[PDB]
Symmetry: D3
């Protein structure tokens, strides 16, 4: 089967309007909540939106059997004020994801957002983590830049600021899925910021003692590791002057395959190996456009991996299902 480890929820429009209202009244109306029926939640999974077809229909067309769906990260407003609206919105998105996966369990598997508020101790996400565990969530999006490309930044991922979360994630045996959210920069919009933040996050993890202190910590880096597999040589070289090689820490990391060129997919898999690659596509999303020279949708990338002749059938099964099943603790 094909399990896509990187999708984002197709939600009723009510969800995004709830965000706008929270921001407008800043909590003066209280928490309230998203009011949508089960029927509206299902309808949202079939609605075209800005894509060539509905979310469910696209996954069928591409041969994807199941997809792990998480919040749309660019909406999660981790730098917004007041803090409570960040928490409330994150909670409502997760609840909506839970409902949709309960209504469409044949296709969608829930992955949670963390209510990271820029500057708050990381322990402030633990209550929502626990609620999500109880709801059957299988992982958590981890944002290395809750400041959303502002004047300030958070500590690097090797900093002890993050250690309470790594400890909890190991206790749960659930993964962190590195994913930045928004960007306040006119130079780097959010879709580019994703990549730069994946690069910084991966670099931090491969030049610190995180995996010495948390040998079982499971981290999936989005978008084939940002720049890292392409730029690995220079960071490996610089690490020869140091304690442990960059590559020896990088070996601990998982990477998803959200890359829309064959050459990039080849380099990722040849660099980190089929044992550390999880098929993911972000479909529907950024890549849901047609190449006019081939007619293929750019985020229909499973065929590239199926056709790679340097991979065995066993390797392909790792990438398409077994790694996700292990990393996200998916049961038969």
């Amino acid at each position: 089967m094909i399990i896509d480890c990187h999708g984002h929820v197709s939600a009723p429009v009510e969800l995004w309007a709830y965000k706008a209202s929270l921001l407008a009244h800043r909590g003066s109306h209280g928490r309230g909540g998203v009011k949508v029926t089960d029927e509206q939640i299902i309808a949202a999974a079939h609605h075209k939106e800005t894509w060539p077809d509905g979310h469910i229909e696209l996954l069928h067309n591409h041969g994807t059997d199941m997809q792990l769906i998480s919040p749309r990260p660019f909406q999660m407003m981790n730098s917004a004020k007041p803090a409570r609206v960040v928490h409330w919105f994150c909670e409502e998105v997760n609840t909506l994801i839970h409902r949709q996966c309960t209504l469409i369990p044949e296709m969608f598997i829930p992955v949670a957002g963390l209510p990271q508020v820029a500057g708050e101790p990381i322990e402030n996400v633990f209550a929502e983590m626990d609620r999500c565990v109880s709801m059957g969530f299988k992982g958590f999006l981890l944002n290395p830049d809750p400041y959303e490309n502002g004047a300030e930044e958070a500590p690097p991922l090797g900093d002890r600021y993050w250690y309470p979360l790594y400890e909890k994630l190991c206790e749960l045996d659930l993964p962190a899925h590195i994913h930045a959210t928004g960007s306040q920069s006119e130079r780097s919009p959010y879709s580019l910021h994703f990549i730069n933040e994946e690069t910084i996050a991966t670099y931090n993890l491969c030049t610190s003692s995180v995996f010495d202190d948390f040998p079982q910590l499971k981290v999936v880096v989005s978008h084939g590791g940002g720049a890292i597999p392409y730029q690995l040589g220079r960071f490996e070289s610089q690490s020869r002057r140091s304690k442990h090689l960059f590559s020896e820490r990088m070996a601990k990391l998982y990477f998803d395959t959200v890359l829309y060129t064959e050459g990039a997919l080849r380099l990722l898999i040849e660099t980190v190996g089929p044992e550390r690659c999880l098929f993911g596509s972000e479909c529907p999303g950024v890549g849901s456009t047609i190449d006019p020279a081939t007619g293929k949708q750019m985020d229909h990338i499973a065929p590239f991996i199926q056709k790679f002749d340097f991979l065995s059938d066993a390797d392909k099964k790792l990438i398409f299902e077994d790694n996700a099943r292990k990393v996200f603790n998916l049961e038969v």
Copy 2:
């Protein structure tokens, strides 16, 4: 013939000491200048330092015939105060490079730093550009982040803030070589910051009308374009609703080959083509370490390109000399 388009000056210690002193008295002692003889400058290009051998000796070992040497970018302190020390130090570095190229002209071709001060109009670098042109300089390092990963940032490269510079570069028919400088971030040290800034600079140039307005502008992006050749699919996808595709603007750009894995070199060349790649190594530098699996230096990357069977001899001559001769206007 092998021409290495990306090297940084091996300078006598007196240069870096001049920087320290300038920062310490902030101009209260006057501009002054670096006081250093020629034997001292030559010695710098032969001194082993932390590398396995001297700068000249390494280039000989690797079969490099000539190298374009520019300032060491991480020393150029474009965010430092007061502004006059940034100008003065850049001018003194350019002068030292000129001396070293004159003293050792069988090897070194001069490329200039620009005295970019965070927040200053770009026209403030023109006087130095003119001086360097008079001295036979063949290009300029262009820093997209003179704020050096500070609380503020400069406008994106498509912003008219930069148009005066593109104008001058087209008048001179000389190239800009994209290279960031330092980084004030605890999360992103300068060696990582280089790559993220190349990604942003390239993204900005490929999603703006720069090459529509300056069809003849010559830009070389360092380090194989940051993340861009690896992450091209997602940015091409997003551009399909736009005046021009990301790839159509990217086709105007040149890239150097400062990449220390074979797979990354292959992906760069397959992505942009031999007609847009310039051999570069940054030797000596972060790559000047021994890969004990081979005994070879990591930045000795010419053999990788020489052994790619998908490239013709003509394609290899483009990468190793012809593109650089054209882009940097090198005379036989």
Copy 3:
């Protein structure tokens, strides 16, 4: 006839979702626009949602014949960045109000938001004003605090920073309707901030030369003037050594009747007179809760005014009808 001069649009949920997305991609996806059908715009004006009933049904239940609808002010994010999303959202709201009034012209009359970006010169709202004039809009919400209770504030309304806008309003002979937007304060939420800002705006206009320099400028102050009619004595007292008395400039202002107690409505009308009061209710909205004493919504305030013995039937026609017709340039319609 009863014309309600203070209502805010009941918009399809797509409009607010559009705002959330603009803020999320910060305009990196381009301007785009709200994608809603005529059917969705009409349904929204009848949808029950947070109130006891739909927007149009409540106006029918209350005997309101027409209502001037403007943007929902607390959504207009005048302090948000980048500036372009403030402009774009304001334009989309105005376009949607035009469509809803076009689709339901027996009920709704269009009043425009201004794309006020904190810190920008006021002339940056003129292009959108001209577009709204072309679309038939009859007035403009004017926000004295586009900084939305932030660390900084705009100049007072008497400052020459605003004079270009007053000039244009006089050229058009169209009113400004004073209305603050959101509030970044934890002490002062937006529904309270409205009142305080109305008080400041009114105070500025009555202690400056605006009406000396723009005698025909038409200004309607929301919510019965914030605190001013109640606190008028202290401001009048301190004005006695100035060019004109506070009351002499205040006589130029119009005031809407969005007040939900009988005693406050009585004080408003006795203070400024029926010649300067425009019936307004903000229904549906803050006042859309059942008053236990009457079994009716608190924003069903028309009967209080109709039953005031100290007003003539002509006075009541001014409040319910004639003043809005004059101030908002309403032609013979229905």
Copy 4:
């Protein structure tokens, strides 16, 4: 008897000069202190200065028997630096009020300033409170905005930041009299800022648990509650889904009658009742200008209340006398 619960000290010029010098040397000359004789303190309460007549003569002309005098709030510079000059000045003002009330006890009753420094924990005012208690003070001015309309603001009055103060006030059984101080805004000068801050403070207290947690806390809101009695409807409406209604917490508050129009006084008393209104005038001060319609000062508001037919003579005794006696713990004196 008529007790005016809202007056501010008429101090010798030396007190204000002392403030200027503290600010100038920023405490580098040490704390020092105001140097004034008993004679200078007495003369100041009779000096004409900016008003039509002396402080005591006006109270006699108006038939006020006694007045509770507190600091002049707009001089108390709660946002000034360094913090020590705020404390020192507050202490000197309180000492001077004690002396003036000691020297003229048939006229003046002491009410204290709190040395609120923007950003300091509220417990830093406790030492001075204890000293004022020892000196016979009968209440405390409480400033909800010690930041004085700056870039920052204090927590709302419902925040636990203030709970230590409410506890102490209940221990002492003495009231807080809500009063803002100066304002750094060019839009909102201090006389207007007073009103807006009273509105926020009242709103905070009526939408929080303060009176649930401190049922015997005594709070008097200056200037008839800012905007609140006039704007009560909208706040009541939005409170219907909360622990208690806005009006249910508002019933705990007392309000002074510093309002200079008859219609506003009528609305105040009809809204909160005579059981919660304390006569106050702020004479001499903002209202100390001749009302042309009466030939009397605008702050001569006692006759308006005395002539309200809808109040019993007992009601008027509550407003003029009994409420202040209960709230400020005034014993049988004169």
Copy 5:
């Protein structure tokens, strides 16, 4: 005769209370003004205040025939907001000084404050200068730090920011009397800040081209030049490496003698000469305390100068009257 060029007004207490009220209402009451009778103004000149005797009586006791009285600088609040209160207060102080000198012309000569608002162009003081000229004022206190030891500072005195004032002062042929005002520092209170600011101001004037561009500019530096005459050697030495000697610019400057030790007075006069020293005492003020070992008031410093045996009678006449008569254009 003895003319004391450095005194500060003994004003009715109403003046300082007016400042407190301006600050309290921030102009919301309008400008208003100080309301005091001629009799109150005279009384203030006879009142002891915090001193051993009244202002007039002290000058009589010390043998001072006339004194130039200026605003009390530590009250002038040049960093206060809003700007208009700085201007209004300065104007009221100057008007009060004018009235007192008109009422007591046998003793007091008027010197004006400038309404310098931190950050305002210096041209904003010219209107008050003109009013003061019309009132017969004979000089102006010049504050080199209107920011009053804040986070920011004004340009050095050689900066062209100040050139419009130097031009006006030469047009009027009236002097600037360097005097700082308040200090927002817990480390340097105002009485120490005076000295440091005199040092900086003098240094700026002796290391710039001010006296080349304004050869006739008359500047009296308060308190014997801060640190400069004592520290002159090091600044002279450093200037030998430069254009003009520190001493050659310093020769253009006048200095008052507000120094309360004999040794300091000797050093000042031996360093700059009797031709550039103007007797001043600041009496009543900081020095109006009794030395318990001699019973002499510390600011009774004329006898020290009268008794110096290295000065001729002509020199002493320069210091005690002739220099002030020339510098402040005092007519017989």
Copy 6:
């Protein structure tokens, strides 16, 4: 015997280059260290540079037998970021000084810099103080302005912020030598800033209870106490209402004689007495210029003190050796 208590290390260029590099990579390269041989260090102490002769040769010319050498304060960058480079650079300077004193022990006695980081608790310099004590250091430079004339300042020296340091200094019975470092001001360059900071530091110490609480604390104020001996009268006057007089606290302080005019040297010695003056010259440095009226170097000031007829031979021995032997605990 002449002991010069105020000299700054003549260091090989490699030291200042190490500073530049540290600032450039901000620790991303590791702490590293200065790499320099002994011939290079000796050569530094003999190299002419910009002076009329080498450091050692000048001291011989002037009759100075030994000099206490400390860091060059204007290089110590106490306001620089990140904090670790301030610590590392201070440590490397102290190590180099130790090497040079060991290599040239007939001349140089070691005095340490403190790794003061603006805003850090003073206890953060104790580890380095201990290390320097173990290495035989005889004193410490104390910077009252680690913020280097920035927007913020440190607490005054009487503040308990500094009491831990005074405690340690009394435990070690070692002195603090007051010396500011750099200055970020365009108005006050560092050579002027030194003097203003000495004035403030001395004022703070003489108007606080430091010497009441640490009667044995040894403090040497550079440059003859800034302005203080010249401006003493006004500060004594203001102190007559205080627990102790300014002069009574000032009597505990020592002053070095780095003053380059005869009159200033005389005023210092007459003001504080021979028992509190330590000969110092800062040679070579800002005073190493030829006064062409004599041909003598401005910082050759020993002859002035030798020829003062108001001092006994015993008084001169105090100034030239005995006070320094006692204050810096020098062994015979």
